[PDB]
Amino acid sequence: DMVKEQIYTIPLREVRKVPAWKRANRAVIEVRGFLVRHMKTESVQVKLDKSINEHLWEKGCEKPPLSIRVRAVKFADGEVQAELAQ
């Protein structure tokens, strides 16, 4: 069951250094890496909600947001569940 239920604002400015058409999956990778380091889990145990992925791809592959606010929950199995947050 749940262990921690913290809300995060994940900055995505480092995503912008990548070539412009690669920015959306670079931002996906940044969100996953942020969750890995801040929740202290593995990359494969970080599950990204459809809200997060659809928000990162809203304006195309070249214009992801400069930040994203997410709600991540960690379980005893080590799995992390991340969803978009208001």
Reference 84, options 60, 61, 67, 59; nearest CA is 67
Strands 80-84 and 46-48: parallel
Q: Which of residues 13-72 bind RNA (CB under 7 A)?
A: 13-14, 16-22, 24-26, 28-29, 32, 37-38, 40, 46-50, 52-53, 56-57, 60-62, 66-67
8-state DSSP, 86 = -
Q: What is the binding site for RNA (CB under 7 A)?
A: 6, 8-9, 11, 13-14, 16-22, 24-26, 28-29, 32, 37-38, 40, 46-50, 52-53, 56-57, 60-62, 66-67
